[PDB]
Design a protein around this ligand. Sequence first.
Ligand code: CLA
Ligand code: CLA
Ligand code: CLA
Ligand code: CLA
Ligand SMILES: CC1=C(/C=C/C(C)=C/C=C/C(C)=C/C=C/C=C(C)/C=C/C=C(C)/C=C/C2=C(C)CCCC2(C)C)C(C)(C)CCC1
Ligand SMILES: CC1=C(/C=C/C(C)=C/C=C/C(C)=C/C=C/C=C(C)/C=C/C=C(C)/C=C/C2=C(C)CCCC2(C)C)C(C)(C)CCC1
Ligand code: SF4
Ligand code: SF4
Lengths: 31, 140, 29, 80, 739, 30
Amino acid sequence: ASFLSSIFVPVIGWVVPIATFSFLFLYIERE
Amino acid sequence: LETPVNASPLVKWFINNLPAYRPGLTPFRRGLEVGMAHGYFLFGPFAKLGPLRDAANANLAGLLGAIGLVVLFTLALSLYANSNPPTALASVTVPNPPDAFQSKEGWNNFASAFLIGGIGGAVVAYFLTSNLALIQGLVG
Amino acid sequence: PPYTFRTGWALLLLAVNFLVAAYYFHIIQ
Amino acid sequence: SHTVKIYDTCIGCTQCVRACPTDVLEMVPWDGCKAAQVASSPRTEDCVGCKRCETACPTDFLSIRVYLGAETTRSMGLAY
Amino acid sequence: ATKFPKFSQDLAQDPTTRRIWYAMAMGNDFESHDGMTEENLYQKIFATHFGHLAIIFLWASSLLFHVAWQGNFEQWIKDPLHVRPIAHAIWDPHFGKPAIEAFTQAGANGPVNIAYSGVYHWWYTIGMRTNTELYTGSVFLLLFASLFLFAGWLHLQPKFRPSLAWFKSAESRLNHHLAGLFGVSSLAWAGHLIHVAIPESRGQHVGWDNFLSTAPHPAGLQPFFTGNWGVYAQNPDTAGHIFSTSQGAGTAILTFLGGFHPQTESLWLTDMAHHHLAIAVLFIVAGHMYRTNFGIGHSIKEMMNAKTFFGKPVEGPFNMPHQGIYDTYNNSLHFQLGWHLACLGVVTSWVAQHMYSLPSYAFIAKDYTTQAALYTHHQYIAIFLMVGAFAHGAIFLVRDYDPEQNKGNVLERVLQHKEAIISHLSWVSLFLGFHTLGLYVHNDVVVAFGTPEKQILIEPVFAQFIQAAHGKVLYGLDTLLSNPDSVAYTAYPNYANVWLPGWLDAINSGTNSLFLTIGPGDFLVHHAIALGLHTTTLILVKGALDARGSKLMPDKKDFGYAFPCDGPGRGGTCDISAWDSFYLSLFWALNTVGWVTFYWHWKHLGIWQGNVAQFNENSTYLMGWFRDYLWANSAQLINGYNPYGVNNLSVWAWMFLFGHLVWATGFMFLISWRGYWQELIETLVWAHERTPIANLVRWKDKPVALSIVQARVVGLAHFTVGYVLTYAAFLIASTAGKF
Amino acid sequence: SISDTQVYIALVVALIPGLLAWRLATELYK
Ligand code: CLA
Ligand code: CLA
Ligand code: CLA
Ligand code: CLA
Ligand SMILES: CC1=C(/C=C/C(C)=C/C=C/C(C)=C/C=C/C=C(C)/C=C/C=C(C)/C=C/C2=C(C)CCCC2(C)C)C(C)(C)CCC1
Ligand SMILES: CC1=C(/C=C/C(C)=C/C=C/C(C)=C/C=C/C=C(C)/C=C/C=C(C)/C=C/C2=C(C)CCCC2(C)C)C(C)(C)CCC1
Ligand code: SF4
Ligand code: SF4
């Protein structure tokens, strides 16, 4: 099942930092 | 009096967490864990010590014996229930009864869940001892 | 004062320094 | 802001008041020293942590001391 | 005016971008948080310690799973001496087609990374044979790491949350951790070797299914209880034992040959079994020493405060005042953390010193690059653990230290004569450096002038002796286990040197790293190492002892541990704080471990290639280091990619250049300091409010330059990462390109 | 190597520490 690399690596490469940075930027800039 | 056996906090924490005494439980829930526990080990001395313990149906000799004696206990629970039982005691390690063991209605709920759990505890012990080489291939 | 407890252990350790050199100089074998 | 502690060892030299560029320091009368005045810091929300006031003090060791604390806009020295 | 960071109101009221950066470097500092009390501190550190513990098991499970699913472990069993291991596989979309063909290696379908961490040798030694045991141990560590993630959550709930007196019960940790964590676990691993790993070493499969049926010994635990323990040391694995087969096998489970297995050139598994069994008995006995609630045992607070040696009044133990040290170790957490990093830092290098000379893993002495990486790894780990020992020891003296509780004791007497410690440390650093650099430059000029016989070459005659006092005939000193007439050789009253015939076979062969032959090139580098240890200690001790103030600046304790300076006054005070003496030392600590690992690597490149004469001639003068090691070995590396093509070294050729760039970037934060850059950002703030379309958007946090203490962190971070990655790309590919 | 089935068991079992790590890291405060 070597096709899981095609679906975990782009999520951790792209989706994981986009979801993390967009959470943290809205959390540090929160009155 | 008071000793490090009846009152050490390791033992007070233990006895107050058995399902006979754990706070906030339906009496069906109390007899469910008491039943599954006592139905699990009582598969033991019938299967490997019984009269047909060398035959190919050795574990089935232990299953019908252990189920058939959970049914005997469940009668004795319902015999103790229907006899207008006296209120339970309060020792130095357990300061209060679990409040479901003074009504006739509460022992009847305790009696049924022993039967539901005691049969299921014996079946899973029949499942695990007949499938030893199954588990040790799922492990190695 | 003549430091007895200090010099007592320094002469013990220096006696270990001289003992190992006796093996290295073949004085003791 | 920062924290400006002034101990009781100074002589009223008025070198620290004439060196703090945001004018935090001022002289108040005080019957202790020979010049009969001690430095005081009543406006420490304006202090920028420059430590020009510690450089100009004669006494050994320093009678004035700047403790660097939480940095707001006035103490960062930001024109924006 | 935001609510981030939660742990500080002084940082959360910062309008600049300093708010963002100081949240990161004060986040795990639990002691400086807002409103943090004493018992809330320990209860939060204890549950955090379940968090770091469960990272370790989740880390070690990915080593098992990525090998079982993507590596060639079952193909590596058949021939471990030529089959080249596999760590994981590459899914890189940015690869070109000649860079998929170059990394399709070791007999695999796709691009794979050759494992240079040696975990196939450790798993093959301890009995694991197929890819299913690797997967089973992987899934077990998923559950075993979740058992600690639940435990840290459980011990933060209010009636499951431990009290303060539970943490400061120090005599009960020492009984449970020595007997249980050290002793039972050494006993359990001896049970794992004897039941499983030693029978797996003889071609005899023992798994979870049949370990209750099969016995490790045909005698079978009857000679244990009767006292006939010599039955366990019957016929061992012979000198023709082919590993993991039944040829030349034995029945013994606890044996004491000493030396190495003749094929794998590792330690005998029967020797390790009697080792961890004997370690286990020495620790369970050691764990029944200190006083707990059972009214028996030694009491450490009474051992410190004792003043009477058999009626004679003394100042304390060894007539030295150790009173109040129990209330100094146990009350402070930085004294504990500063202490135990020194303890863990000693053993970490001590691991590395004994794993190249005494290999304990099957076929690891012949897989070279896995052995060159494991030495250099645990040496650099030992570097940071020793620098942080003095670092967290110096946070103790600023923050936690109390001179009244510690009055008159041995830790007070060090702070009195601290100018005598730093002076004689400054002497040895200069006494070595003036005369070690002097003899390299002497040998450099002398060889350059074509007359190399005028070199000053010193035989290391004090370490020549120790190797001959351990049994090396090669020098002819004829003492002490090399003298066969010696009292130490024969063990005169009892003659019980069982280890000694197997030890002298190992030390007298020229086919291992056991007590390598040393010469005049090894004289100068051990005195160059001693230059690096006494000088790194000089910076760290002087920053520890002067952490509470001195002549140029008294009351440095009022300013905390990390503050920039005290201004340009008094001549200026740049890098005056106790943090700044942590800072200067990590240049030396990375330097010194360079010297100990340039010298490790180049002595073994002569052993592995059969050319011992290249090192012994050329390591006396500093061109031979520069030419025959740095220049000559980086030819396979730098040709990892050229205009002709690529090969499998092109990552290490790319990481080598990457390391030279991160290293050089860190100079920018150190040569140039802050006030240049705040006057540069104030022109970018101007030209953003004036640009007509781009001033629709605007910052929430005002841009300021990095603070003075911050870009010494950021400067040291680019320096250290680039120092590691440069050598780690040179260490691997110069060894894995030559074998 | 290991079978294609066994990889999915390892992923589902890995949600059990993934859930518990989210519980611990939020019990340690925000
Ligand atoms: C921390 C441990 C760790 C690390 C660094 C890696 C590293 C890698 N894995 Mg792997 N993996 C691990 C544990 C680990 N694995 C475990 C336990 C499992 C079983 C569930 C897997 C299952 C797995 C699969 C199925 C695949 C990878 C793949 C990969 C590669 C690409 C990264 C990726 O997509 O992640 C994938 C990540 C996951 C599937 C889930 C992560 C599971 C661990 C337990 C999370 C650890 C989080 C960490 C502790 C949080 C701390 C962050 C830190 C910065 C503070 C890379 C070699 C891919 C690959 O080989 O591409 C070629 C791929 O297809 N991994
Ligand atoms: C017998 C009972 C027992 C046991 C097993 C433990 C075990 C542990 N306690 Mg502990 N504890 C106990 C009783 C016990 N405690 C009691 C009674 C108290 C109260 C008085 C405490 C109070 C306490 C506190 C307050 C803390 C612990 C912590 C820990 C953990 C230490 C960190 C760790 O995992 O290192 C594991 C270390 C080893 C397995 C030994 C390593 C030996 C050296 C360093 C290396 C030797 C290995 C060798 C070279 C070979 C390795 C090679 C191989 C890896 C390839 C560990 C799980 C800490 C922790 O992390 O909390 C979770 C912590 O903060 N304990
Ligand atoms: C188990 C050991 C241990 C423990 C528990 C601690 C715990 C602590 N230390 Mg300590 N320390 C340690 C080891 C340890 N340290 C070691 C080994 C050293 C020597 C290097 C130090 C040096 C040290 C100093 C000098 C200081 C501390 C401080 C602290 C406290 C706060 C930490 C903090 O703010 O984190 C914040 C974390 C960071 C800022 C992390 C940034 C650094 C990361 C690791 C860089 C990584 C680079 C990058 C990811 C690489 C990518 C590569 C890629 C490009 C290819 C805390 C009590 C500080 C304090 O004030 O104490 C109260 C403090 O001043 N420690
Ligand atoms: C042949 C070339 C050569 C050269 C160029 C040097 C050059 C140097 N040596 Mg060196 N040395 C050499 C050979 C050489 N050495 C040899 C063969 C020996 C073995 C005996 C030594 C032993 C030696 C010692 C023991 C010391 C030096 C020191 C020095 C430095 C200052 C010397 C001086 O006069 O300062 C001017 C002199 C003074 C400022 C005060 C006098 C200090 C003298 C050197 C010590 C004598 C005091 C006492 C009698 C002995 C002290 C006990 C000692 C045995 C441990 C200087 C760089 C010193 C050093 O490294 O300081 C950092 C130092 O302490 N050297
Ligand atoms: C060791 C020890 C101990 C312990 C002991 C005991 C107590 C044991 C027991 C054990 C047991 C005795 C167990 C049991 C278990 C059980 C189980 C595990 C079961 C399961 C079951 C199931 C799962 C079932 C289910 C079901 C039902 C319920 C119904 C329907 C059907 C079915 C089947 C589904 C003590 C602490 C004292 C002390 C120390 C040591
Ligand atoms: C050879 C040999 C031997 C011997 C050995 C020995 C004797 C060893 C030694 C060892 C040692 C001798 C070690 C040591 C080490 C040390 C160190 C490592 C230190 C460190 C420290 C620290 C770091 C500290 C810290 C601190 C500070 C800084 C401040 C205050 C606080 C504190 C204290 C914490 C024997 C006989 C056995 C056998 C044979 C061989
Ligand atoms: S603090 Fe310094 S400048 Fe101010 S009065 Fe005292 S001595 Fe003068
Ligand atoms: S912070 Fe120092 S330099 Fe600045 S105004 Fe105050 S006393 Fe003067």
